[PDB]
Amino acid sequence: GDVEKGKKIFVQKCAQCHTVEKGGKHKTGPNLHGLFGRKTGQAPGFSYTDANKNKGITWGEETLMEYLENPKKYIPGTKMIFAGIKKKGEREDLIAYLKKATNE
Numbered sequence: 303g304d305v306e307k308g309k310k311i312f313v314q315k316c317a318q319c320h321t322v323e324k325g326g327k328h329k330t331g332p333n334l335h336g337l338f339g340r341k342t343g344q345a346p347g348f349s350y351t352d353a354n355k356n357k358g359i360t361w362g363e364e365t366l367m368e369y370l371e372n373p374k375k376y377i378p379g380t381k382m383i384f385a386g387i388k389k390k391g392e393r394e395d396l397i398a399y400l401k402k403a404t405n406e
């Protein structure tokens with residue numbers, strides 16, 4: 303995907319609840335640094351729902367593609383309020399941005 307396009311998507315749809323940078327703060331949602339290769343619900347010091355702690359998948363390109371299409375269908379009972387992104391390219395750009403920014 304296109305990293306700079308994904309940044310614009312992140313800032314528009316995600317940044318109000320999430321930071322990405324190393325040492326970034328939790329907000330409404332958890333900081334996402336280190337997300338890739340981490341299991342669900344494992345950012346330290348954040349009140350996750352049991353739902354998000356129990357989903358039990360490893361976050362990566364493919365599981366984020368499925369999650370971001372419809373978060374509540376993938377993790378029923380999640381307290382993340384976000385409808386999803388049905389568009390494929392948008393998700394791919396976003397995920398490419400996240401794979402850079404949450405690893406930098």
Ligand code: HEC
Nearest residue numbers: 315316319330331342343344350351354380381382383384
């Ligand atoms: C506030 C209204 C949010 C919006 C906008 C976005 N996210 Fe979110 N996210 C939010 C919360 C409160 C939580 C915890 C949910 C729970 O049930 O505990 C989350 C969680 C995630 C995760 C899982 C993180 C993990 O398992 O460590 C991811 C990958 C995630 N959120 C990504 C994300 C994306 C990419 C967003 C824009 C498209 C987005 N969220 C918006 C709160 C909010």
